[PDB]
Design a protein around this ligand. Structure first.
Ligand SMILES: CC1(C)CC[C@H](c2cnc3ccccc3c2)c2cc(C(=O)Nc3ccc(C(=O)O)cc3)ccc21
Ligand SMILES: CCCCCCCC/C=C\CCCCCCCC(=O)O
Lengths: 217, 230
């Protein structure tokens, strides 16, 4: 009954829901603002996210927004060859990333995220669970009841591993192989936060305040 | 079966290159920027532990069958991960202390002044977060090995091949962890994903290291390359 606590099918519903002046920095910023305007829509369709207190909802979203977007545009970029497919439809390539001062991040996204998801054929369901795991992060500081949050996260572990045993029985170590993208995702997500000063997301509006107004909406 | 051999090899590799907290005779000696004396003892043990971590690596099945460059690349990059993980399995929550491989036991302020500095509370929080896991020699060893044989590391000559070495390790951890904890299989992903917290700490740790190679002249000479050159 693992899939009943945290339904795979409802998680993919959340992914499929929020799935989508021209210069590098502008292109990245506007791609970020777009996906930012719809995380709250995504998280709301994650099982039991809405049943959490509203102050906890804000915290979890402000804690993983960058890493939720990176995971999402990395998997989306499996199509593109040697580049990033932004949520706005634009293709960003190495030089364009160097122009934006994020060439090293670009290279890491390609080798540690896109290539790995490509070679193991990570489907959108597993990406969704990975993002749900990122969402239900119990270390998020200020959380009112973290025990509920990692009870929720562990339900995603249970569902995801159940799904992997089901759809890929010939690959017993596939659940672990998926999880091993999460350290890379965290590593890369940290480096991106170093560039926030150059990428004005929203009208310099505090990310915190933005999500809350989306939630109390 | 053949996985139990792997578990036993990895446990033996860990046990020989890193003794457990409980079998170790302890000895001992406010917050400041850096206690240079503690730093000397701390830096002198960290060097020994590096050497032991290389010994541990060469004991891992099929590690030395990598390109000697990729061997260097992997050890050079998982280096702090294993040090930080190892010392955190020597944490004593009663005394809020950590014990080194010679018995040296420092408390939180001493760990801070020894070189942990602003990273002190991160590391100590990570060690506390390990206590509920109740990890033993085999599990600590496996987690280290999984952390070392990482195909994500850049400049790898045979990245796919490292990925192959890592797979039997991920299986071993899964079955071993869940056998000892039959009513709560979430402990396996919970233990793997500690690597995520470990990378973060280690990343900031690499910040700390460059600051100290300059503020402490002639500190931390490179030494993984050349020992592995032989
Ligand atoms: C906070 C930070 C990053 C500061 C730099 C320092 C370090 C790292 N490498 C060194 C290499 C050579 C000399 C000194 C060094 C000091 C370093 C080392 C560690 C660490 O676990 N060291 C460590 C771990 C285990 C043992 C032992 O089992 O006896 C001894 C030392 C943890 C954090 C840091
Ligand atoms: C192409 C490499 C990307 C690196 C971006 C670094 C910028 C750091 C600032 C904010 C992080 C936002 C990352 C981009 C989000 C794009 C969303 C999308 O297209 O799905």
């Amino acid at each position: 009954s693992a899939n009943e606590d945290m339904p795979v099918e409802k998680i993919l519903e959340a992914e499929l829901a929020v799935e989508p002046p021209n210069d590098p920095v502008t292109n990245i910023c506007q791609a970020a603002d777009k996906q930012l305007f719809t995380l709250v829509e995504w998280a709301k369709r994650i099982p039991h996210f809405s049943e959490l207190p509203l102050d906890d909802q804000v915290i979890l979203l402000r804690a993983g927004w960058n890493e939720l977007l990176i995971a999402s545009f990395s998997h989306r970029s499996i199509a593109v060859k040697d580049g990033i497919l932004l949520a706005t439809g634009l293709h960003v390539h190495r030089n364009s990333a160097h122009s934006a001062g994020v060439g090293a991040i670009f290279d890491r996204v390609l080798t540690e995220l896109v290539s790995k998801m490509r070679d193991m054929q990570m489907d959108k369901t597993e990406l969704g669970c990975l993002r749900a795991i990122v969402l239900f992060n119990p270390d998020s500081k200020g959380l009112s009841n973290p025990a509920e949050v990692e009870a929720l996260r562990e339900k995603v572990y249970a569902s995801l591993e159940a799904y992997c045993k089901h759809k890929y029985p010939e690959q017993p170590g596939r659940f672990a192989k998926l999880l091993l993208r999460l350290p890379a995702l965290r590593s890369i997500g940290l480096k991106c936060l170093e560039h926030l000063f150059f990428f004005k997301l929203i009208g310099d509006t505090p990310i915190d305040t933005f999500l809350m107004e989306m939630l109390e909406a | 079966p053949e996985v139990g051999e792997l578990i036993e090899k990895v446990r033996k590799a860990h046990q020989e290159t890193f003794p457990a907290l409980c079998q170790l005779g302890k000895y001992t000696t406010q917050r400041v920027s850096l206690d240079i004396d503690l730093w000397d003892k701390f830096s002198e043990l960290s060097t020994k532990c590096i050497i032991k971590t290389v010994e541990f690596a060469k004991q891992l099945p099929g590690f030395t069958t990598l390109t000697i460059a990729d061997q260097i690349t992997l050890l050079k990059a998982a280096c702090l991960d294993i040090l930080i993980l190892r010392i955190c399995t020597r944490y004593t929550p009663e005394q809020d202390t950590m014990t080194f491989s010679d018995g040296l036991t420092l408390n939180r302020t001493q760990m801070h002044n020894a070189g942990f500095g602003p990273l002190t509370d991160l590391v100590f929080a990570f060690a506390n977060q390990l206590l509920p896991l109740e990890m033993d020699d085999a599990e600590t060893g496996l987690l280290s090995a999984i952390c070392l044989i990482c195909g994500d590391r850049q400049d790898l000559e045979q990245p796919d091949r490292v990925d192959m070495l890592q797979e039997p390790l991920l299986e071993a951890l899964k079955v071993y962890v869940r056998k000892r904890r039959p009513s709560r299989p979430h402990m396996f992903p919970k233990m793997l994903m500690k690597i995520t917290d470990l990378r973060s700490i280690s990343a900031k740790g690499a910040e700390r290291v460059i600051t100290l190679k300059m503020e402490i002249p002639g500190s931390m000479p490179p030494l993984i390359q050349e020992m592995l050159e032989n």
